[PDB]
Design a protein around this ligand. Sequence first.
Ligand SMILES: *[C@@H]1O[C@H](CO)[C@@H](O[C@@H]2O[C@H](CO)[C@@H](O)[C@H](O)[C@H]2NC(C)=O)[C@H](O)[C@H]1NC(C)=O
Ligand SMILES: *[C@@H]1O[C@H](CO)[C@@H](O[C@@H]2O[C@H](CO)[C@@H](O)[C@H](O)[C@H]2NC(C)=O)[C@H](O)[C@H]1NC(C)=O
Ligand SMILES: *[C@@H]1O[C@H](CO)[C@@H](O[C@@H]2O[C@H](CO)[C@@H](O)[C@H](O)[C@H]2NC(C)=O)[C@H](O)[C@H]1NC(C)=O
Ligand SMILES: *[C@@H]1O[C@H](CO)[C@@H](O[C@@H]2O[C@H](CO)[C@@H](O)[C@H](O)[C@H]2NC(C)=O)[C@H](O)[C@H]1NC(C)=O
Ligand SMILES: *[C@@H]1O[C@H](CO)[C@@H](O[C@@H]2O[C@H](CO)[C@@H](O)[C@H](O)[C@H]2NC(C)=O)[C@H](O)[C@H]1NC(C)=O
Ligand SMILES: *[C@@H]1O[C@H](CO)[C@@H](O)[C@H](O)[C@H]1NC(C)=O
Ligand SMILES: *[C@@H]1O[C@H](CO)[C@@H](O)[C@H](O)[C@H]1NC(C)=O
Ligand SMILES: *[C@@H]1O[C@H](CO)[C@@H](O)[C@H](O)[C@H]1NC(C)=O
Ligand SMILES: *[C@@H]1O[C@H](CO)[C@@H](O)[C@H](O)[C@H]1NC(C)=O
Ligand SMILES: *[C@@H]1O[C@H](CO)[C@@H](O)[C@H](O)[C@H]1NC(C)=O
Ligand SMILES: *[C@@H]1O[C@H](CO)[C@@H](O)[C@H](O)[C@H]1NC(C)=O
Lengths: 427, 342, 133, 49
Amino acid sequence: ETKCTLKSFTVEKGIYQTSNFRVQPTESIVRFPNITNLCPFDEVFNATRFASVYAWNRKRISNCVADYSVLYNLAPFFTFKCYGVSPTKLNDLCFTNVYADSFVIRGDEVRQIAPGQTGNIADYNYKLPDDFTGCVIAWNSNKLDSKVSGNYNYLYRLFRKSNLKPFERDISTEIYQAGNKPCNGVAGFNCYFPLRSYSFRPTYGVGHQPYRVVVLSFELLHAPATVCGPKKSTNLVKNKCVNFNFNGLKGTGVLTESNKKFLPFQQFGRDIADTTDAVRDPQTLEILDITPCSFGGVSVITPGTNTSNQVAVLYQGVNCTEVPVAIHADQLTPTWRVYSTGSNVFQTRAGCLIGAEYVNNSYECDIPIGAGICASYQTSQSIIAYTMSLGAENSVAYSNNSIAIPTNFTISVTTEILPVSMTKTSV
Amino acid sequence: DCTMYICGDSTECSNLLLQYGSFCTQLKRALTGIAVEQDKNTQEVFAQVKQIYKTPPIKYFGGFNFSQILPDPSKPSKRSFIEDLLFNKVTLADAGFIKQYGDCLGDIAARDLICAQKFKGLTVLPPLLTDEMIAQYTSALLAGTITSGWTFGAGPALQIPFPMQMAYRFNGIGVTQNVLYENQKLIANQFNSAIGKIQDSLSSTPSALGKLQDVVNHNAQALNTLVKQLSSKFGAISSVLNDIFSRLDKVEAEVQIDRLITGRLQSLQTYVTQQLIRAAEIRASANLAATKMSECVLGQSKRVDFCGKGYHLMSFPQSAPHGVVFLHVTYVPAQEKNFTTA
Amino acid sequence: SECVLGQSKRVDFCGKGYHLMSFPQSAPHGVVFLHVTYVPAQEKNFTTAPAICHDGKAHFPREGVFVSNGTHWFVTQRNFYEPQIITTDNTFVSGNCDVVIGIVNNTVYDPLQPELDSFKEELDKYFKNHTSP
Amino acid sequence: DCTMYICGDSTECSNLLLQYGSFCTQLKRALTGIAVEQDKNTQEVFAQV
Ligand SMILES: *[C@@H]1O[C@H](CO)[C@@H](O[C@@H]2O[C@H](CO)[C@@H](O)[C@H](O)[C@H]2NC(C)=O)[C@H](O)[C@H]1NC(C)=O
Ligand SMILES: *[C@@H]1O[C@H](CO)[C@@H](O[C@@H]2O[C@H](CO)[C@@H](O)[C@H](O)[C@H]2NC(C)=O)[C@H](O)[C@H]1NC(C)=O
Ligand SMILES: *[C@@H]1O[C@H](CO)[C@@H](O[C@@H]2O[C@H](CO)[C@@H](O)[C@H](O)[C@H]2NC(C)=O)[C@H](O)[C@H]1NC(C)=O
Ligand SMILES: *[C@@H]1O[C@H](CO)[C@@H](O[C@@H]2O[C@H](CO)[C@@H](O)[C@H](O)[C@H]2NC(C)=O)[C@H](O)[C@H]1NC(C)=O
Ligand SMILES: *[C@@H]1O[C@H](CO)[C@@H](O[C@@H]2O[C@H](CO)[C@@H](O)[C@H](O)[C@H]2NC(C)=O)[C@H](O)[C@H]1NC(C)=O
Ligand SMILES: *[C@@H]1O[C@H](CO)[C@@H](O)[C@H](O)[C@H]1NC(C)=O
Ligand SMILES: *[C@@H]1O[C@H](CO)[C@@H](O)[C@H](O)[C@H]1NC(C)=O
Ligand SMILES: *[C@@H]1O[C@H](CO)[C@@H](O)[C@H](O)[C@H]1NC(C)=O
Ligand SMILES: *[C@@H]1O[C@H](CO)[C@@H](O)[C@H](O)[C@H]1NC(C)=O
Ligand SMILES: *[C@@H]1O[C@H](CO)[C@@H](O)[C@H](O)[C@H]1NC(C)=O
Ligand SMILES: *[C@@H]1O[C@H](CO)[C@@H](O)[C@H](O)[C@H]1NC(C)=O
């Protein structure tokens, strides 16, 4: 491992930090609302009469199971235009509400349904918000809606005093006034009927046929959801690592019992780090606390590759009664658990070291470890970790009537090295 | 830890991060460099002696009271009471190697302690030198400078009594030494009153130890800003990555996660650069402290206004959390009379 | 600018211990200093007193120290052992000898006193050649 | 100033800059620190009496 992370075959004598360890999970749990009846999307998608562009029909759907598998072939969904949420993974998310707004529009101006497109059918009739989440389905209706005499039922608008804010509808129809003269009357200078009937017959041009359109809107991460996928539940696991999936929230860790008190509308718990920590299970109504399993840095203490290959492994700041939980099979992401079943283990202030042995005598420090502990390669050969020696203790007798005066001397030579100029460069 | 901080609990994010290159490897190398140099600073400052000198049991320093700064045998540690006051006054010290996993799962108040903000791969490493051995070094320096004169910085230690030692210190200023032998009791009483007033002044105000409090405050503020900055959206869809992986397909979400990863590495590198600047400043200050340690204590400095206001007489070192406190004993002329000169 | 062009009185700046001089050598992107330093060797112990009083008057040295071998008293410089008879260069009288602590008794032979005692020994014999007989 | 140089005289640019958190707060903190120690330099060098 240290040869892989140092890119060199011969490593020098010392300590080297390497890749951290991790605790692998065991299984997975999913907890969803358990509803029986399917969502009644059939009467929405197969209504005998649909709505106009200025009077689109809006239906909220709640308390059922979002099952779009049968919606693949039947209701064939010619448009894959879903951009807020990928439609392939639609069943993996849970929505607190879903709204279907349907109507019938001119087949040419389908692209005006998309947000940001101006005009008259997308400005004076209905427009999407800027941050809209959801998507629209558009398809042709020539056999059913269009008649040989003309489907003269759906009414479009072409004028308004000002552009309307999104998600707004009007019912009133009044003869327009567009000048100083109050032309209320019945007709006059720009005094026309507001909503005009369609003129659609199948013999017209291509793309001019009437289209059935329906937009689906939903918001996320607001409340405990009532309509989502058909995934079965399982049994809750306490104090064990697991891959949990609560209402699309996928995470890994352990789940304990917490004593905090929620509110009847509150579902998720946050912290300063913008990470979920406290959740409430949808089925049983206690408080669950989320915590990922522990980890830490790994250090290797080794002598030179010129010397033997006997190493020592130090774990960074972990309780040493908890590291035997790491010693199992198929339990740790680092697969080199052969040393994990090692030798006597001794605890320091920053973890516990495997592969050495304390000696109560004191030598000079050679390898840094921490908290005054130092390692060396010594006696048979092994690696010893001991207490750093500050030096040799030497008492000096104080006196108030004596004096120590040197009688001889010496002249010695000392060297000093100073960098003066690093190498110039240019790019 | 780059993998957990940038791409925590996601295998595909870790693969896409490994695809980027050698950024966090260089970051880890720079952090090992700053840690090794920071241990080296404390190593070279207090290693001016090779033997741990033992203090004598006799505490009669020629009428000079000294029990405030010598280590106290009644204390279980070898700490002087001045050092204990300095240690417990700055009650914001390191606790990164105390909170183990049991303290992490202790559930104090929904785990709102530092363990919450060290779950994101941020780790504090303990220093090599512990408190008792630093105190032993300071005690050895004080024992060498209290009885062996000032020659113990030049090889062997030669025992000199305190009276003619202070007489030589007066001789190195400009006043002849003999006067000290007529003012022994008065100078001893002045020294004891001054050394009591030092502890009184330190215990008086709470705005005197800012020079060490600001360093740990800045460190904690930098860590808090780093852990708070993760809530930034960075122009993405959500601040949590697993929602992006479970909501969008793998042919359009790579742009958003790319923007998020680049922003987080930008913030991390900004933090690293700020740490480097603070390391350079601390290194310069530590070198200045080493010069003061070598010159104002192991000898008497002829430079004016370098080891205390007025003419410098002698000095004392004391340890402190991440710092050193010097006590400069110095000479100040009192009231004066003017006459006619020639 | 400091160590090479003159002796430095700053301790532990141009070499360990007492400093004498330094020589420079060049190196690829660097300089190498060769400091020549002077270090005291093995020592000896003696018994000392802070002053000396002879005629009811104290005496002090302006450099060095009084040392005793158990029999005689000498003046000595600090950093090299050299016993010597009392020196006018390290003798001055400031008040009587009842206020200082640790003082002893001995005859004083600073060359001011050999002006009557031993520096004028030929003149002392010339003076005693008439008074004594 | 945080808003003037980057998203000055525009509401929506400030709205999108509000997502980024405490970047320019750290910028202001660093610049105020260098300003106060810059004053401290003159105070240290010129107030010896
Ligand atoms: C998941 O399905 C189960 C089984 O239907 C629901 O369990 C009901 O409520 C409590 C526990 O939540 C049980 O003691 C009852 O016996 C169950 N009653 C019925 C009629 O099944 C559970 O409520 C469902 N969870 C959700 C979130 O809908
Ligand atoms: C809601 O109704 C009000 C009428 O009370 C509309 O306000 C009118 O807007 C037009 C737009 O040019 C003005 O000419 C009128 O003077 C307004 N009326 C009044 C009384 O001030 C408003 O537009 C309607 N809301 C929407 C979204 O259309
Ligand atoms: C101080 O120490 C030196 C080093 O030992 C002494 O020099 C030695 O002197 C003896 C006497 O002639 C010689 O035999 C040795 O060869 C010398 N040593 C070296 C390395 O040259 C010196 O004599 C001592 N000074 C005093 C006054 O004792
Ligand atoms: C040296 O100073 C210390 C501190 O001032 C003295 O300890 C105090 O002594 C007085 C009376 O002797 C007591 O009332 C205090 O309670 C002592 N303080 C503590 C903290 O115990 C000490 O006596 C002095 N020693 C000498 C020889 O002067
Ligand atoms: C010396 O200082 C004194 C006071 O600072 C100056 O004042 C004179 O001396 C005393 C006051 O101590 C008075 O009795 C005199 O009347 C003061 N005035 C004069 C004109 O002597 C004094 O000027 C200073 N200089 C000298 C040479 O004495
Ligand atoms: C809805 O109508 C289509 C076409 O008319 C038909 O194929 C489908 O079966 C209908 N849905 C149901 C649930 O019958
Ligand atoms: C190992 O080190 C020794 C000296 O420490 C050296 O002589 C020897 O050549 C080294 N081994 C190799 C393979 O270089
Ligand atoms: C682990 O925690 C227990 C708590 O009872 C403690 O006794 C033990 O010393 C800890 N282990 C280490 C290596 O510190
Ligand atoms: C070191 O001390 C411990 C505790 O007293 C003891 O168990 C161990 O045997 C000692 N080892 C040696 C080599 O003395
Ligand atoms: C020297 O110190 C001892 C105690 O170490 C003391 O008994 C003695 O009186 C002192 N001598 C003088 C002259 O003060
Ligand atoms: C002089 O110093 C030496 C150094 O150890 C010591 O052994 C000796 O006892 C001292 N002599 C006296 C008289 O204290």
